[PDB]
Ligand binder design. Structure first.
Ligand SMILES: O=C(C[S@@](=O)C(c1ccccc1)c1ccccc1)NO
Ligand SMILES: O=C(C[S@@](=O)C(c1ccccc1)c1ccccc1)NO
Lengths: 306, 306
């Protein structure tokens, strides 16, 4: 029993982190097979980031200008190319620690773990969600660019995020491993604001199910509701609209607990309308939305990875 | 910027986890050099745990009764012994993945990372604190015993916790790596209740400093206080008494922010007396106490580990 914000074990990713230096700029890269992946703004100076022409700036760079260091060992760069907003650096040595992996572009509302790194070295691991406005609420300081976000299924690491920017509001933006930004953000130091940070309704419901499984049930009530009725409340409180697809994904948690999805929606509705009256739910005084239904099942059942 | 509940990278510990089976009981062990460490209640059945005599139950066990498996490979047990509440199983092969490590017994209020494992396999990582009542609020299911808690300093893993029990209230108890329980708990299925769960005042203050560094400053006020005056409030709200030693440890955070420790105590005092009026602090609607001053400095500065 107990429910915690849990990250995947990070070892398989730790073995992939390297340091990339171009000129006077140093950030992190991801070494998979004989390719190192990193943000293309490694080639920029602080002056450049105001209005960079990446294609023009890359013309002045050759293989030997990209210094790649894995732990204490230097890797030989034998080719380089730009794909969207990442660079791919071909090296002469396949990473012997390459895990089974894939590249995935995730949807808003999905969660992943982040290995924060500096100078190619791991600093910490934590769990995040892709917000509905395509930012993430992370913990990133200067030099953390190139750190990546990932999920694991048994033995396969699914890389879904590479860190690129910090917006002026303190939230974070980045790309998939093909270099396409999440959301409308660009790798330019300009005026880009985040949209509304709406709450991920299906994740809150899954967390309420997690609560019930662990003994926190004071919020269960005598009511039920319908999807349309609940969604009128969701709109008022800047919650994502709940669909039948969401109801279907919560089916297994409904089955294990015996609480119909729409009955749990009626509990959530009362919590949004009345607040929590100074009580807590799984140690939290607000409604948590960065656990997916899969996350809840996984933690409440003890799935492992070899 | 941003502040997250962050765990240490777990790879160095992942490489130490093994599976231990005695009879029909399977839990996790920790393989360091040529010794595997695990809870002594691996030798018990469910019937035994009501009133076990561990010395008598061990007499019926020989080296070949302890089955130790690291990944897919079986380890040869060539000796075994009991130390307090852990067993030490000598094996014929030193773990090649043994990190630099030490065994440490931590104090209440100190934080550590937990690698939850099942059947010797890692499941997830999260951050915990040793509570003032010597429990931890974890996430542990059946089969998680032997999972361990640890800190890392550059290249040295300091093991401080091994998981042994779940109390009837859902909180968790366990030992250091010498097998001595934290607090008054015993490896018996009897009536053991936790004491008062007091809040770790020095950690809350450090987290308020973290908040200020990241732009959340609405709770700063015009007041100051004294240690004795603040502690009258701490007592009322079941907070740990604040000492000069605590004030001294917060010195560096005081210096970086320019906010005197006693001024931050006066902010905390108003927050305890008035609540947060529906606002949040670093994404939380209550006062977080599982970040130490060291944790705050580390995350706000980007310390790494090689
Ligand atoms: O190297 C860093 C600083 S980077 O965030 C920042 C940047 C600054 C100088 C050179 C390259 C990039 C930037 C600016 C605009 C848009 C995205 C990123 N972190 O690791
Ligand atoms: O094997 C497990 C179950 S264990 O928690 C439980 C126990 C049950 C059967 C055999 C050994 C131990 C126990 C009971 C009383 C005090 C501490 C622990 N988890 O990994």
């Amino acid at each position: 029993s107990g429910f915690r914000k849990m990250a995947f074990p990070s070892g398989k990713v730790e073995g992939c982190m390297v340091q990339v230096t171009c000129g006077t700029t140093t950030l992190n890269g991801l070494w998979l097979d004989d390719v190192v992946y990193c943000p293309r703004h490694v080639i920029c100076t602080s002056e450049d980031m105001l209005n960079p022409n990446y294609e023009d700036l890359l013309i002045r760079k050759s293989n030997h200008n990209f210094l790649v260091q894995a732990g204490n060992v230097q890797l030989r760069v034998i080719g380089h190319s730009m794909q969207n907003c990442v660079l791919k650096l071909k090296v002469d040595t396949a990473n012997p620690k390459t895990p089974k992996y894939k590249f995935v572009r995730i949807q808003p509302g999905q969660t992943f773990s982040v290995l924060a790194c500096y100078n190619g070295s791991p600093s910490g691991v934590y769990q995040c969600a892709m917000r509905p406005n395509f930012t993430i609420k992370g913990s990133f300081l200067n030099g953390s660019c190139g750190s990546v976000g990932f999920n694991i299924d048994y033995d396969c690491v699914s890389f879904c995020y590479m860190h690129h920017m910090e917006l002026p509001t303190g939230v974070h933006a980045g790309t998939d491993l093909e270099g396409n930004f999440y959301g409308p953000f660009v790798d330019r130091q300009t005026a880009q604001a985040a949209g509304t940070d709406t709450t991920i309704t299906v994740n809150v419901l899954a967390w309420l199910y997690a609560a019930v499984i662990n003994g926190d049930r004071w919020f269960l009530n005598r009511f039920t509701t319908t999807l349309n009725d609940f969604n009128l409340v969701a709109m008022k409180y800047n919650y994502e609209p709940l669909t039948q697809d969401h109801v279907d994904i919560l089916g297994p948690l409904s089955a294990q607990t015996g609480i119909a999805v729409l009955d749990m929606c009626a509990s959530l509705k009362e919590l949004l309308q009345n607040g929590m009256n100074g009580r807590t739910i799984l140690g939290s005084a607000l409604l948590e939305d960065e656990f997916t239904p899969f996350d809840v099942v996984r933690q409440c059942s003890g799935v492992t990875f070899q």
